[PDB]
């Protein structure tokens, strides 16, 4: 659709505006010192502005976004550049979730080199990615059959290849037992899923367990309790917590 472009405010442009909505604005926007008004099509003006037409709303998008910092690592998308030591994990946008940032955080606290990770509901790959990189091998699997391909490109980007299946953790079994378990999903499925999660670990192993709001953890907690695991920290952000059990 088409954009007329005015200089001004909203409320400096009011006197004009039954000029645009009798015109045919659908939308208004105040884009500093200037009003973009969103049309279906252009038409006849008398106020001096610039028609516009906007796949545009993308590398628009995409010029907002900023990398962002999970000490040791940074997540870029493929077109930042960005100097220094953090570990870099390329992923693209097609994440800087809190969850994520903590699942981040906790697998470069609890992971130990050469330790086989399982990553549950990868997504974009981006834990299973982190794991390789402080030294791990991981599987990632997702139930989505078409996020894998994106999650095996996003590692090529890293220079890493951790292995991508489709399926839930029923899936991996035959792979494990696995060192590291680290699942950003929610409460109530961690809840159903702790005993299998026993399983899925060696003794000694650890479970990293994210996505969870903080009023629910007590749901994880009570069913980690209920599954034989010891409580080894509890870190936050936002509403979010991560919890992290030992086995």
């Known amino acids: 659709m088409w954009v007329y472009r005015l200089k001004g405010t909203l409320e400096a442009l009011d006197p004009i505006l039954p000029g645009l909505f009798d015109g045919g604005a659908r939308g208004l926007w105040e884009r500093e010192g200037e009003v973009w008004a969103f049309f279906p099509a252009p ?44 570990i870099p994990l390329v992923i693209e946008p097609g994440g800087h979730h809190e969850t994520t940032r903590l699942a981040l955080k906790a697998l470069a606290r609890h992971l130990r080199p050469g330790d086989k990770v399982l990553d549950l509901g990868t997504g974009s790959g981006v834990l299973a990615i982190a794991a390789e990189k402080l030294g791990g091998k991981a599987l ?38 696995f060192d590291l378990l680290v699942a950003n999903l929610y409460a109530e499925l961690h809840a159903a899923l702790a005993p299998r999660y026993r399983e899925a670990l060696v003794p000694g192993g650890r479970a990293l367990l994210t996505g969870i709001l903080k009023d629910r953890a007590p749901l994880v907690r009570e069913a980690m309790a209920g599954a034989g695991f010891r409580p080894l920290e509890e870190a936050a952000e936002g509403e979010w917590v991560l919890l992290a059990y030992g086995r």
């Open 43 to 86: 038409v006849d003006l008398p106020y001096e502005g610039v028609w516009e037409e906007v796949e545009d709303w993308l590398e628009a998008w995409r010029r907002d976004l900023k990398p962002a910092l999970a000490p040791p690592f940074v997540v870029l998308a493929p077109w930042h550049t960005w100097e220094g030591a953090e």
């Open 140 to 177: 990632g699997v997702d139930i989505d059959p078409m996020v894998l391909p994106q999650a095996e490109a996003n590692a090529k980007r890293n220079g890493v290849r951790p292995r991508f299946l489709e399926g839930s953790l029923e899936a991996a079994l035959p792979f494990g037992p």
